[PDB]
Structure formats: structure tokens, C-alpha cells
Short mmCIF file of C-alpha atoms in Angstrom, two decimals:
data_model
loop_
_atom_site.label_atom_id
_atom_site.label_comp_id
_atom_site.label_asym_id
_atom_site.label_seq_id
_atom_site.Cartn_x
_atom_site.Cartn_y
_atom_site.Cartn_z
CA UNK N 3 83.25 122.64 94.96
CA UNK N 4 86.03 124.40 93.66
CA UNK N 5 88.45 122.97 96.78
CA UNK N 6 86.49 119.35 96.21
CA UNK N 7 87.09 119.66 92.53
CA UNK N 8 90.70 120.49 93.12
CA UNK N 9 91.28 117.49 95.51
CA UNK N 10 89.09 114.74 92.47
CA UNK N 11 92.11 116.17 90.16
CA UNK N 12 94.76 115.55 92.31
CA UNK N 13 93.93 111.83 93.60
CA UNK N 14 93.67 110.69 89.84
CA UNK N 15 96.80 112.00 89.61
CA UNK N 16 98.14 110.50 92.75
CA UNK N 17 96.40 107.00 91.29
CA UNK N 18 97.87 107.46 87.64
CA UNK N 19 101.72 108.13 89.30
CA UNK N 20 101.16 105.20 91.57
CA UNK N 21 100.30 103.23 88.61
CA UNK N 22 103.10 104.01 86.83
CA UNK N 23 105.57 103.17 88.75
CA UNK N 24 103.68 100.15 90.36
CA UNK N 25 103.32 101.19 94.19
CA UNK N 26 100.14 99.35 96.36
CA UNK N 27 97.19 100.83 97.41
CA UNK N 28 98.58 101.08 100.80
CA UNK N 29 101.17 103.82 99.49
CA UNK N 30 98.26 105.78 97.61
CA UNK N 31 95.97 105.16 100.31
CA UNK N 32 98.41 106.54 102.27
CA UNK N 33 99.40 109.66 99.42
CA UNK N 34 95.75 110.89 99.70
CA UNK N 35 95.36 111.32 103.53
CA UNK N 36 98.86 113.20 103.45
CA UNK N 37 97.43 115.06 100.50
CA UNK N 38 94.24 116.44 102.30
CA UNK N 39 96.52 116.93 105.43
CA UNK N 40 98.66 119.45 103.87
CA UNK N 41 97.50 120.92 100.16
CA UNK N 42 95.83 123.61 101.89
CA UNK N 43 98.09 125.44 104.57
CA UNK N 44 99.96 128.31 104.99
CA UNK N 45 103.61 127.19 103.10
CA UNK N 46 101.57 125.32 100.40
CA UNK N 47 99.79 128.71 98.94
CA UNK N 48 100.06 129.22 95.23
CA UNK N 49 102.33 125.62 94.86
CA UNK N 50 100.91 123.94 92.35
CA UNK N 51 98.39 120.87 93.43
CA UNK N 52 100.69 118.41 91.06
CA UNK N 53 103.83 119.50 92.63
CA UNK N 54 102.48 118.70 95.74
CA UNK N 55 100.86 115.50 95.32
CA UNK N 56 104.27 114.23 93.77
CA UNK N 57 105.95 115.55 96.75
CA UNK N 58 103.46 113.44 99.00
CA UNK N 59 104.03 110.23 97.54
CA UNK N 60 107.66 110.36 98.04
CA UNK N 61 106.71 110.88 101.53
CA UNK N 62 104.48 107.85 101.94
CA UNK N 63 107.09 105.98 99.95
CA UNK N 64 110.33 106.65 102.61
CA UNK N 65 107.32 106.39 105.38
CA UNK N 66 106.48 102.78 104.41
CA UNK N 67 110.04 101.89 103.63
CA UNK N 68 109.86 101.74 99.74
CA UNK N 69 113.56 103.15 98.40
CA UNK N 70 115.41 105.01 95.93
CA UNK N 71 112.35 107.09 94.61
CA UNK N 72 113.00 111.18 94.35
CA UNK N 73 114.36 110.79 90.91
CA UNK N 74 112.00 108.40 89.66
CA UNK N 75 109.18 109.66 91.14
CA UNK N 76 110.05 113.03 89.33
CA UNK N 77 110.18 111.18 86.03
CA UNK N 78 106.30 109.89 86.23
CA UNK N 79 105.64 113.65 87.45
CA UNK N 80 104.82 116.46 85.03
CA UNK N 81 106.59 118.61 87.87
CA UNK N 82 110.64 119.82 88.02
CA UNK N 83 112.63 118.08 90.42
CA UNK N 84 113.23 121.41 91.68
CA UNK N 85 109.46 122.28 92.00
CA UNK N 86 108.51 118.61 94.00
CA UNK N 87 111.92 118.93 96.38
CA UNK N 88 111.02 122.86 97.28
CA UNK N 89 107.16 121.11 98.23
CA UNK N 90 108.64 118.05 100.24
CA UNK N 91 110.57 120.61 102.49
CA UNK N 92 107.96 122.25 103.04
CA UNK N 93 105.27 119.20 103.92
CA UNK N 94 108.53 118.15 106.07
CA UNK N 95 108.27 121.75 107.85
CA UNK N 96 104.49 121.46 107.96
CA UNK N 97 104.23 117.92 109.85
CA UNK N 98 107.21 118.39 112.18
CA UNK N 99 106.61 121.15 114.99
CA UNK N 100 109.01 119.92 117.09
CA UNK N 101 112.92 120.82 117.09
CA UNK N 102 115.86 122.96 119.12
CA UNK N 103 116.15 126.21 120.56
CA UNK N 107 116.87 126.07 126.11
CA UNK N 108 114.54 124.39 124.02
CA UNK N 109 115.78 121.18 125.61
CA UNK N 110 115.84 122.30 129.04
CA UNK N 111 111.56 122.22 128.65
CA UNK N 112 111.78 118.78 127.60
CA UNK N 113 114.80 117.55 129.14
CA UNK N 114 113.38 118.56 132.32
CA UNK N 115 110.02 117.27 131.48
CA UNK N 116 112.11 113.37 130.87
CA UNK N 117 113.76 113.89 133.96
CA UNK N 118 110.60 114.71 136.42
CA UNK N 119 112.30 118.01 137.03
CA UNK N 120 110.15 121.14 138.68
CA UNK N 121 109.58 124.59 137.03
CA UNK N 122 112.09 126.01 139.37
CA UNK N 123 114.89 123.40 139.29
CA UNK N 124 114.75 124.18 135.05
CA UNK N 125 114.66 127.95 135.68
CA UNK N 126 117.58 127.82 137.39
CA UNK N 127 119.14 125.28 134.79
CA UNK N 128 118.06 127.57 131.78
CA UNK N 129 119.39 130.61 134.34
CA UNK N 130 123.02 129.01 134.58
CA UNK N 131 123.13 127.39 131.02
CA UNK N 132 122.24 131.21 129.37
CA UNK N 133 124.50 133.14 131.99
CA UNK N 134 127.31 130.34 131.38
CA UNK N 135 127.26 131.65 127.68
CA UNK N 136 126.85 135.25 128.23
CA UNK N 137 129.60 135.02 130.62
CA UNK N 138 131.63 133.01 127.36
CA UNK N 139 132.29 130.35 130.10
CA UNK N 140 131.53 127.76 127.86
CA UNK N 141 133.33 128.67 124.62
CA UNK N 142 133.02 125.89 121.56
CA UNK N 143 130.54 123.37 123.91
CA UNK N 144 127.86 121.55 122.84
CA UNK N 145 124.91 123.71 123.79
CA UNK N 146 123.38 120.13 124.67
CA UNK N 147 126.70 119.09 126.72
CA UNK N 148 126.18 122.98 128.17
CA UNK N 149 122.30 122.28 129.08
CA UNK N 150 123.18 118.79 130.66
CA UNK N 151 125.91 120.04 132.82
CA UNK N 152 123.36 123.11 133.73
CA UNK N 153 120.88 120.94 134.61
CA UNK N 154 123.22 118.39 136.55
CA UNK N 155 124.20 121.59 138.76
CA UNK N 156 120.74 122.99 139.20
CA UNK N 157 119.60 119.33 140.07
CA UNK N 158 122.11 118.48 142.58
CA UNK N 159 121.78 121.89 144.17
CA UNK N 160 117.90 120.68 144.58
CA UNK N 161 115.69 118.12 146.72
CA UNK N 162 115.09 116.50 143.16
CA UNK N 163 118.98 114.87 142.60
CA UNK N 164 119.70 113.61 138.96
CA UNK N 165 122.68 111.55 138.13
CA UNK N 166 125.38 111.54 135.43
CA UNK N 167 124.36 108.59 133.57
CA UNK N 168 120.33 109.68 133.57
CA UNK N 169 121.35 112.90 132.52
CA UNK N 170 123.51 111.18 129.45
CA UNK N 171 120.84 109.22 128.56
CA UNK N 172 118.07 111.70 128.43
CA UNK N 173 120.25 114.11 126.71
CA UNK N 174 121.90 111.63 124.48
CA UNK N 175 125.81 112.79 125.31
CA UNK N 176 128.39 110.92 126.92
CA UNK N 177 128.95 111.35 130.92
CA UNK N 178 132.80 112.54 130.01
CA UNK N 179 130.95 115.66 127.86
CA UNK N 180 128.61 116.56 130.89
CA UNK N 181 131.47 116.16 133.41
CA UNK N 182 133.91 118.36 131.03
CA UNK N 183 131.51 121.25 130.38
CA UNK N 184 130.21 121.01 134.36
CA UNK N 185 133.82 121.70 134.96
CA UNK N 186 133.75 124.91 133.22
CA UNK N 187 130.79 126.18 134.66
CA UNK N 188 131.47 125.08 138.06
CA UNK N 189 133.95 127.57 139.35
CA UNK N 190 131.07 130.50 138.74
CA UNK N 191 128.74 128.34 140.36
CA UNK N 192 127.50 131.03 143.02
CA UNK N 193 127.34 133.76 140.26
CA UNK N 194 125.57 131.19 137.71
CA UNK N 195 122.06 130.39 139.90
CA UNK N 196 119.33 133.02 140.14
CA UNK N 197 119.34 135.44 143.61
CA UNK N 198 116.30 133.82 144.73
CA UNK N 199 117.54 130.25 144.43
CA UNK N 200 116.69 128.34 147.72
CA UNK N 201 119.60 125.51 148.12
CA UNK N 202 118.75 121.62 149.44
CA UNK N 203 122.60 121.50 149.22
CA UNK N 204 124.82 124.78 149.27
CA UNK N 205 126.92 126.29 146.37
CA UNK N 206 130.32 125.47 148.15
CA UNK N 207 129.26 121.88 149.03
CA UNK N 208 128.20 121.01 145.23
CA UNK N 209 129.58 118.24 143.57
CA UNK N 210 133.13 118.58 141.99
CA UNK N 211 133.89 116.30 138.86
#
């Protein structure tokens, strides 16, 4: 086939760069799977096979802790440096679908047990906080952790500082400093419909 004949071509290629700069089967083994994985998708469209191969076995190299490589591996490569590093971004692009938006209020939320309304009303406050320029020069992570601190203690379903911290991966002064902001709008901050466990005026001040 010509997509069978095109994958033969590239594995002896994979196999003859491996060999030259004496990597283990493990790393080719490895170089192939990747290969199959992402040679044929989307990003990868009219980038040459070679280019792409050599960018694979970079990436199974750092993957299997083997150092130093990008320039050498461009050496044993028929390819441009440019060529193979403009392929490994892409692959990178290709096997990571997961990044940052209120992006982190889905999975914050989701590593803090947290129901669909208690993060609406967190992503409410955090994105009326900023619209509102309440929150000038925060950490929009420090910004969602404070949100969700306020939505959550207005709530039957009470997180703490120090969860919230260590979920969100900021320190309890950064979630207590950007709360502090946000708190004086408080009642103008939830959504109409919110139904309080404990009321805007009694919320916690820090």
C-alpha cells in the first residue's frame, strides 16, 4: 500500500538513525509506535515522513530519559534542524489535549468534589471579578482559587484554604490576597439565582 509502503521507508530509517547513534531497541521500539501514532494527522500533512520520524525519536529519547540529543539527532538526520523542531512541536501539540483557558474551574472543581452549580457560580464571580477590573495584575489561577473559595464557602459543599492551595498549586497568602479583592463585591459577584447555605454578609473575611 502506498500508506504501508510509506511507513516500511520510514522504520528503516528510524532503525538506521538509531543505529547510528547507538540507542536500544526499546527507544526504536518505542520511535515506531509514536511514528504510526502521529505521521498521519491533521498538523503532520505535507511534512515530510523523515522529518517526522527524526522528530519522534527525540521524543522517545527525553521520554525514556536518554539526554542531550536535538542537535545530534539532527546530525544522523538528512532533515534541517529547523524542519525536525517545527515537527516535534507539532507531535507535542498532537499528543497533549490538555492545557488552560475557567479552564481550571472544570477541573479544579472536578479535584475538589465540587457540584455544577457551586463552579457556575465560581466561574460567575472569577469572570465578573475581571470584567469588573477587580482583580487587576492577579494570577488568573490565584483569581479562580479565591472564586472558588467564595462560591464554596457560600455552599453546603465548604472547601478550605490549604485544599484549595494544594489543588490549585498557589500559596494560601495568594488565595487570601486576591479573595480580599473580590470580597467587598461579593453580593454583586454571585449569579441572581444563587441559593446561599451561608449568606453574602456572613461570608468569611480574610
Amino acid at each position: 500500500s502506498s500508506s504501508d509502503r510509506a511507513m516500511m521507508n520510514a522504520f528503516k530509517e528510524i532503525t538506521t538513525m538509531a543505529d547510528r547513534i547507538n540507542l536500544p531497541r526499546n527507544i526504536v521500539d518505542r520511535t515506531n509506535n509514536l511514528f504510526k501514532q502521529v505521521y498521519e494527522q491533521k498538523s503532520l500533512k505535507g511534512r515530510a515522513n523523515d522529518a517526522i520520524a527524526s522528530a519522534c525519536l527525540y521524543i522517545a529519547c527525553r521520554q525514556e530519559g536518554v539526554p542531550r540529543t536535538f542537535k545530534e539527532i539532527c546530525a544522523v538526520s538528512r532533515i534541517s534542524k529547523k524542519e525536525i523542531g517545527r515537527c516535534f512541536k507539532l507531535i507535542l501539540k498532537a499528543l497533549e489535549t490538555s492545557v488552560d483557558l475557567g479552564d481550571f474551574m472544570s477541573r479544579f472543581c472536578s479535584n475538589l468534589c465540587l457540584p455544577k452549580q457551586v463552579q457556575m457560580a465560581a466561574t460567575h464571580i472569577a469572570r465578573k471579578a475581571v470584567e469588573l477590573d477587580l482583580v487587576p495584575g492577579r494570577s488568573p489561577i490565584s483569581v479562580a482559587a479565591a472564586a472558588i473559595y467564595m462560591a464554596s464557602q457560600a455552599s453546603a459543599e465548604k472547601r478550605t484554604q490549604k485544599e484549595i492551595g494544594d489543588i490549585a498549586g498557589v500559596a494560601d497568602v495568594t488565595i487570601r490576597q486576591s479573595y480580599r479583592l473580590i470580597y467587598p463585591r461579593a453580593p454583586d459577584l454571585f449569579p441572581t439565582d444563587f441559593k446561599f447555605d451561608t449568606p453574602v454578609d456572613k461570608l468569611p473575611q480574610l
